[PDB]
Design a protein around this ligand. Structure first.
Ligand SMILES: [Mg+2]
Ligand SMILES: [Mg+2]
Ligand SMILES: [Mg+2]
Ligand SMILES: [Mg+2]
Ligand SMILES: [Mg+2]
Ligand SMILES: [Mg+2]
Ligand SMILES: [Mg+2]
Ligand SMILES: [Mg+2]
Ligand SMILES: [Mg+2]
Ligand SMILES: [Mg+2]
Ligand SMILES: [Mg+2]
Ligand SMILES: [Mg+2]
Ligand SMILES: [Mg+2]
Ligand SMILES: [Mg+2]
Ligand SMILES: [Mg+2]
Ligand SMILES: [Mg+2]
Ligand SMILES: [Mg+2]
Ligand SMILES: [Mg+2]
Ligand SMILES: [Mg+2]
Ligand SMILES: [Mg+2]
Ligand SMILES: [Mg+2]
Ligand SMILES: [Mg+2]
Ligand SMILES: [Mg+2]
Ligand SMILES: [Mg+2]
Ligand SMILES: [Mg+2]
Ligand SMILES: [Mg+2]
Ligand SMILES: [Mg+2]
Ligand SMILES: [Mg+2]
Ligand SMILES: [Mg+2]
Ligand SMILES: [Mg+2]
Ligand SMILES: [Mg+2]
Ligand SMILES: [Mg+2]
Ligand SMILES: [Mg+2]
Ligand SMILES: [Mg+2]
Ligand SMILES: [Mg+2]
Ligand SMILES: [Mg+2]
Ligand SMILES: [Mg+2]
Ligand SMILES: [Mg+2]
Ligand SMILES: [Mg+2]
Ligand SMILES: [Mg+2]
Ligand SMILES: [Mg+2]
Ligand SMILES: [Mg+2]
Ligand SMILES: [Mg+2]
Ligand SMILES: [Mg+2]
Ligand SMILES: [Mg+2]
Ligand SMILES: [Mg+2]
Ligand SMILES: [Mg+2]
Ligand SMILES: [Mg+2]
Ligand SMILES: [Mg+2]
Ligand SMILES: [Mg+2]
Ligand SMILES: [Mg+2]
Ligand SMILES: [Mg+2]
Ligand SMILES: [Mg+2]
Ligand SMILES: [Mg+2]
Ligand SMILES: [Mg+2]
Ligand SMILES: [Mg+2]
Ligand SMILES: [Mg+2]
Ligand SMILES: [Mg+2]
Ligand SMILES: [Mg+2]
Ligand SMILES: [Mg+2]
Ligand SMILES: [Mg+2]
Ligand SMILES: [Mg+2]
Ligand SMILES: [Mg+2]
Lengths: 127, 51, 172, 159, 185, 58, 222
RNA sequence: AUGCCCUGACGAGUAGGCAGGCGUGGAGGUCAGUGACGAAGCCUAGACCGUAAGGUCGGGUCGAACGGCCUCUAGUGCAGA
RNA sequence: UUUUAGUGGGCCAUUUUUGGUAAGCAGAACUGGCGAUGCGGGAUGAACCGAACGUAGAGUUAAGGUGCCGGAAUACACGCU
């Protein structure tokens, strides 16, 4: 298990979708701020979407922590994985997406031997 | 780290004001007045009850 | 203002060098509190004398209670009021057990029958009418007849439930 | 069209103040002005030379220069969002001394005098002015002064 | 809501660090930050603030200005501290015995100071031999002697040097600059 | 087309954004417009005083 | 030889000396308050028995509360509210009564409720909402030593020394009152009374002089 | 030690300014980085991190290249014309 | 102290005003506002009342309300219609 952290409070779990991304396919869901002179979203009329602002930011004790309680670390190989040896209560190894399956077996074996929690121990496994 | 109100919290009311113990022991907040019997003048009562 | 109180207010007009010991003017004021009473005191002294609150002082304010609060009394009230088009002097009779009760009834009555506000009304005089047949108004005179008794027909009983099971009655 | 001459809107400012027309009395010409004295500006309408502009009526300034018949006056004038120093060349009939600088100088002399009698004995004499204070407790007698007043008055027209 | 009198979130308007990425100047700032916090000498605070300053806010101090400051009464044996460059001066022929602590010395300035028997010192050696700024004399070069300051506040009746590329007759000596052609200024 | 000729509206609020400045007086003002004969004699009265305080201390 | 056992004990002895002084100061202040109020009651009684009228000394302290918010204030009342440090609604400040400040209180009259505070309200205000101004930074009181560290030059040693200097307007009222941060009061817990606040109290609203009813108001807001 | 910690106050915003960041093509350096045991791309009301720009992972499809960090550079970010 | 952006069409309200029979008309003065600004109330509304806004929680309020739509007394009281 990880360190004793306080209960993680996210303040806004919901994705900040762009205005009218539901309405037009050409308007992607990626957040864009309205720069319109008569934009009800920009003028913050009641009943409209929330805008991302700094008050929603996470408490710095729990920020970047997963629900497990570990900061994630992207790992390509055994040498990258062993830079987390003394940090197994603060860090969990993410295996990179482009690692081949036979190297994933080696990384998972080393991380089980070292006690490193792995967030994705199931990619590219013949299961 | 945390402001404790005096007039609640008797411990903070004794940290401030060491006379808060003596005030309570002599009770000093419900003490009897001297019982004098001074009477107002007839000119006062006449003016008070005047039309 | 549901409980008016009556106050004697004595004010002075502050002693200068030419006049030590000035003349000590006194008023009876109906007000909710002593602040309104002193305010009304300076309001009426700036109408009678050449004085104002900056050049005068209050030397006394006392609440006058009713001498017999549980004796029924007939009062004549002389009142000056502003209408929407002028100023009128008015005499009314009010039957209560107290002067401030009579004055509260007067203010409610003046607001009801004349749409006169508190700011438009001067109480010129409240006097207990000492003898019967000095009572001028016949809405007061009907309550001074001998062995007076009346019923209250159509008694409406207050219900605390929404639904009633009985089809109620207004007997009395 | 419009009109913005030197003496525009000066119909009443440079008028000569009922039953005080004619010649200027001579103490006006025998007052002595030193550099640094604080003077008031009020233009005499009967002398047209050395005459201040209408802006400077009622303005109070400092003598910086003394000449044959005239003194120069520093006046602060609010031009936009700042103050500019203006130098004026005014004859002495448009000039009088400020009585405020009299009153403050006798207060300076009084302060020095009471500080001397505090140095003689009794230090901390408390020699600043104070604003008007709330009055203390009185006892008001009712001796030939029984409080007797009537009520508000009925309305009568008296026309 | 609040009726704010001052502007909210207002930075001080003062450098609290040098804008340069000089590692050695950061080491000097670390040392003098420590001294200015733990010593309560006003010299150390003044030197830290002067270490933050920009290039035109640290003009060079000439050795003739150093020698003139050393000709003050009681200031002959003081350590002259220049937070900035010390330049040479060929217009002075006598140079006194001195200890000068500076950031930089030019080659001529270093040669003149050590040829007069004196010593050229850095700010860390100044901090070691004078941790409280004992027996020091801070010297600053002339700020408004710069060429840019000539053109500052250009306007009528200012006498403040128009921004001009070529200078002579035919370059702004006519209408607006003499009574004969129009008006003067 | 016809428009708004003139108004002094908002001008005092703009002047109080930086809050109308007094002109920062100094000891020793300039001799601008001070009488030239007084200035000429003031030059020599200060020359002689510089020499008098030079000889007083040396 | 760090001398913890004797440094702590010498500091404790100094603490007990300071607490003895604070105890005798507060006993003296309690006797002073009691004899002042009983002498005013007996002066009223003796004047009535002599047929005179005892006129009380006019009040020297008011407590002012800003009761109107931030928007749409004319500039001269806005300046005077900043000068009395009433920069937000339900801010409170003790004010020494002079002519020079009774004409400030006439300018800000439609925006504030004021009146004459009693010892009970000054005591409860300073114990519950009392904050100092110390490099400025709004420090809660909660200790007599931090009061003494800024007001000990004026002979103000404790929180009741501060309360006494406020209520009896002493020579260092200006320093004791500017040291207190403006009181950040709540809304009144029972309400304002008065269905409409922004009339005069004489006319059935809230603003102006409500001479001794300010005690009830501020106790509801505190 | 543009680190860590303590204390206090504050937070509206068009036009506009300034800051700190996110992303794209290419360049120098590095991770002796990833990869036909599957690079890139693409799809995915599956997951994780970031206030957000975005980043990461899982599954499908695919078949040859492509990433992180430190810097450099610009033909570098689209809903409208 | 230097440097530089945008702006140089304004409009509404109280009070003082000019022209006009007048105007949601035209033109000034002082302040506050809208523009540039959401929130609670005025059913609705650029400007009115109240109050100006980081993200939350609890409490108390303003203005406005409390038959029902609608949260809150078909309250209490004196009359008038
Ligand atoms: Mg999120
Ligand atoms: Mg988002
Ligand atoms: Mg598109
Ligand atoms: Mg988008
Ligand atoms: Mg925009
Ligand atoms: Mg819109
Ligand atoms: Mg729109
Ligand atoms: Mg009144
Ligand atoms: Mg009627
Ligand atoms: Mg019946
Ligand atoms: Mg004219
Ligand atoms: Mg004329
Ligand atoms: Mg005149
Ligand atoms: Mg002539
Ligand atoms: Mg600098
Ligand atoms: Mg040059
Ligand atoms: Mg230049
Ligand atoms: Mg050339
Ligand atoms: Mg030439
Ligand atoms: Mg030419
Ligand atoms: Mg045309
Ligand atoms: Mg125009
Ligand atoms: Mg105007
Ligand atoms: Mg402005
Ligand atoms: Mg301006
Ligand atoms: Mg104050
Ligand atoms: Mg002060
Ligand atoms: Mg407050
Ligand atoms: Mg309640
Ligand atoms: Mg209300
Ligand atoms: Mg109101
Ligand atoms: Mg209101
Ligand atoms: Mg705030
Ligand atoms: Mg903001
Ligand atoms: Mg950022
Ligand atoms: Mg390219
Ligand atoms: Mg690239
Ligand atoms: Mg290359
Ligand atoms: Mg294969
Ligand atoms: Mg692939
Ligand atoms: Mg593809
Ligand atoms: Mg989809
Ligand atoms: Mg799949
Ligand atoms: Mg193929
Ligand atoms: Mg191929
Ligand atoms: Mg790859
Ligand atoms: Mg391109
Ligand atoms: Mg392009
Ligand atoms: Mg776009
Ligand atoms: Mg666009
Ligand atoms: Mg298109
Ligand atoms: Mg700019
Ligand atoms: Mg235009
Ligand atoms: Mg119009
Ligand atoms: Mg708009
Ligand atoms: Mg616009
Ligand atoms: Mg608004
Ligand atoms: Mg409302
Ligand atoms: Mg509404
Ligand atoms: Mg309506
Ligand atoms: Mg209003
Ligand atoms: Mg708000
Ligand atoms: Mg309901």
């Amino acid at each position: 298990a990880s360190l004793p952290h306080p209960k993680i409070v996210k303040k806004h779990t919901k994705k900040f979708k762009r205005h009218h991304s539901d309405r037009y396919h050409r308007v992607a869901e990626n957040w864009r701020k309205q720069k319109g002179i008569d934009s009800v979203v920009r003028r913050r009329f009641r009943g409209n979407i929330s805008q991302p602002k700094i008050g929603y930011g996470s408490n710095k004790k729990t920020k970047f922590l997963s629900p497990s309680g570990h900061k994630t670390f992207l790992v390509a190989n055994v040498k990258d994985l062993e830079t987390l040896t003394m940090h197994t209560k603060t860090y969990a190894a993410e295996i990179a997406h482009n690692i081949s399956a036979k190297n994933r077996v080696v990384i998972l074996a080393r991380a089980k031997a070292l006690g490193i929690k792995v967030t994705n121990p199931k990619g590219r496994l013949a299961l | 780290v945390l402001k404790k109100n005096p007039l609640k919290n008797k411990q903070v009311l004794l940290r401030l004001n060491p006379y808060a113990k003596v005030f309570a022991a002599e009770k000093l907040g419900s003490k009897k007045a001297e019982k004098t019997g001074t009477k107002p003048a007839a000119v006062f009562t006449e003016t008070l009850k005047h039309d | 203002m549901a409980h008016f109180k009556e106050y004697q207010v004595i004010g002075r007009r502050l002693p200068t060098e030419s006049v030590p010991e000035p003349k000590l003017f006194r008023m009876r004021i109906f007000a909710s509190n002593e602040v309104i009473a002193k305010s009304r005191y300076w309001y009426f002294l700036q109408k009678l004398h050449k004085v104002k609150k900056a050049s005068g002082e209050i030397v006394s304010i006392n609440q006058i209670n009713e001498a017999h609060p549980t004796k029924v009394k007939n009062f004549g009230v002389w009142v000056r009021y502003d209408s929407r088009s002028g100023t009128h002097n008015m005499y009314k009779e009010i039957r209560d057990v107290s002067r401030v009760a009579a004055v509260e009834t007067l203010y409610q009555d003046m607001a009801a029958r004349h749409r006169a506000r508190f700011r438009s009304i001067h109480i010129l005089k409240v006097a207990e009418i000492e003898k019967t047949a000095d009572v001028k108004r016949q809405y007061v005179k009907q309550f001074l007849t001998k062995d007076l008794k009346f019923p209250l027909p159509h008694r409406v009983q207050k219900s605390t439930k929404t639904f009633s099971y009985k089809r109620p009655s207004t007997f009395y | 069209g419009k009109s913005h001459g030197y003496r525009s809107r000066t119909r009443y400012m440079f008028q000569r103040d009922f039953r005080k027309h004619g010649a200027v009395h001579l103490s006006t010409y025998l007052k002595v002005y030193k550099v640094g004295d604080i003077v008031d500006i009020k233009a005499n309408g009967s002398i047209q030379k050395g005459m201040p502009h209408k802006f400077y009526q009622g303005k109070t300034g400092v003598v910086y220069n003394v000449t044959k018949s005239s003194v120069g006056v520093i006046i602060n004038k609010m031009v936009g969002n700042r103050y500019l120093e203006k130098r004026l060349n005014l004859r002495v009939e448009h000039i009088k001394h400020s009585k405020c600088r009299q009153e403050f100088l006798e207060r300076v002399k009084a302060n020095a005098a009471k500080r001397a009698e505090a140095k003689a004995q009794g230090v901390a004499v408390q020699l600043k002015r104070q604003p008007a204070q709330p009055r203390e407790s009185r006892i008001v007698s009712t001796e030939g002064n029984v409080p007797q007043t009537l009520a508000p008055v009925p309305y009568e027209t008296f026309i | 809501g609040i009726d704010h009198t001052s502007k909210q979130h207002k930075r001080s308007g003062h450098r609290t660090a040098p804008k340069s990425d000089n590692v050695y100047l950061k080491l000097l700032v670390k040392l003098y930050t420590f001294l200015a916090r733990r010593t309560d000498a006003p010299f150390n605070k003044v030197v830290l603030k002067a270490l933050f300053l920009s290039k035109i806010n640290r003009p060079p101090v000439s050795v003739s200005r150093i020698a003139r400051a050393l000709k003050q009464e009681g200031a002959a044996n003081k350590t002259v501290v220049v937070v900035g460059t010390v330049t040479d001066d060929a217009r002075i022929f006598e140079f006194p015995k001195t200890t000068v602590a500076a950031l930089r010395f030019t080659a001529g300035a270093r040669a003149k100071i050590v040829k007069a028997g004196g010593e050229c010192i850095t700010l860390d050696q100044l901090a070691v031999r004078a941790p409280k700024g004992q027996n020091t004399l801070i010297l600053r070069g002339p700020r408004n002697s710069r060429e840019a300051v000539r053109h500052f506040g250009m306007g009528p009746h200012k006498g403040k040097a128009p921004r001009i590329l070529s200078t002579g007759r035919k370059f702004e000596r006519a209408r607006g600059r003499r009574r004969s052609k129009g008006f003067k200024v | 087309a016809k428009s708004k000729n003139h108004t002094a509206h908002n001008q005092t609020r703009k002047a109080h954004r930086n809050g109308i400045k007094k002109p920062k007086t100094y000891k020793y003002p300039s001799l601008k417009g001070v009488d030239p004969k007084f200035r000429r004699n003031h030059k020599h009265a200060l020359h002689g005083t510089a020499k008098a305080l030079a000889a007083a201390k040396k | 030889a760090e001398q913890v056992a004797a440094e702590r004990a010498a500091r404790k002895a100094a603490n007990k000396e300071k607490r003895a002084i604070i105890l005798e100061r507060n006993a003296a202040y309690q006797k002073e308050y009691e004899t002042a109020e009983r002498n005013i009651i007996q002066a009223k009684r003796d004047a009535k028995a002599a047929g005179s009228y005892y006129v009380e000394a006019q009040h020297k302290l008011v407590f002012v509360v800003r009761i109107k918010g931030i928007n749409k204030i004319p500039p001269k009342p806005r300046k005077v509210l900043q000068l009395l440090r009433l920069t937000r609604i339900n801010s409170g400040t003790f004010v020494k009564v002079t002519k020079a400040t009774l004409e400030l209180l006439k300018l800000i009259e439609p925006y504030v409720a004021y009146g004459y505070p009693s010892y009970s309200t000054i005591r409860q205000l300073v114990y519950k909402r009392g904050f100092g101004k110390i490099n400025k930074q709004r420090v809660p009181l909660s200790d007599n030593a931090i009061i003494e560290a800024n007001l000990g030059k004026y002979g103000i040693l404790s929180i009741d020394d501060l309360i006494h200097e406020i209520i009896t307007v002493g020579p260092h009222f200006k320093q004791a009152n500017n040291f207190l941060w403006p009181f950040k009061l709540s809304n009144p817990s029972g309400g304002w009374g008065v269905p409409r606040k922004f009339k005069h109290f004489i006319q059935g609203g809230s603003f102006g002089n409500r001479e001794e009813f300010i005690n009830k108001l501020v106790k509801s807001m505190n």
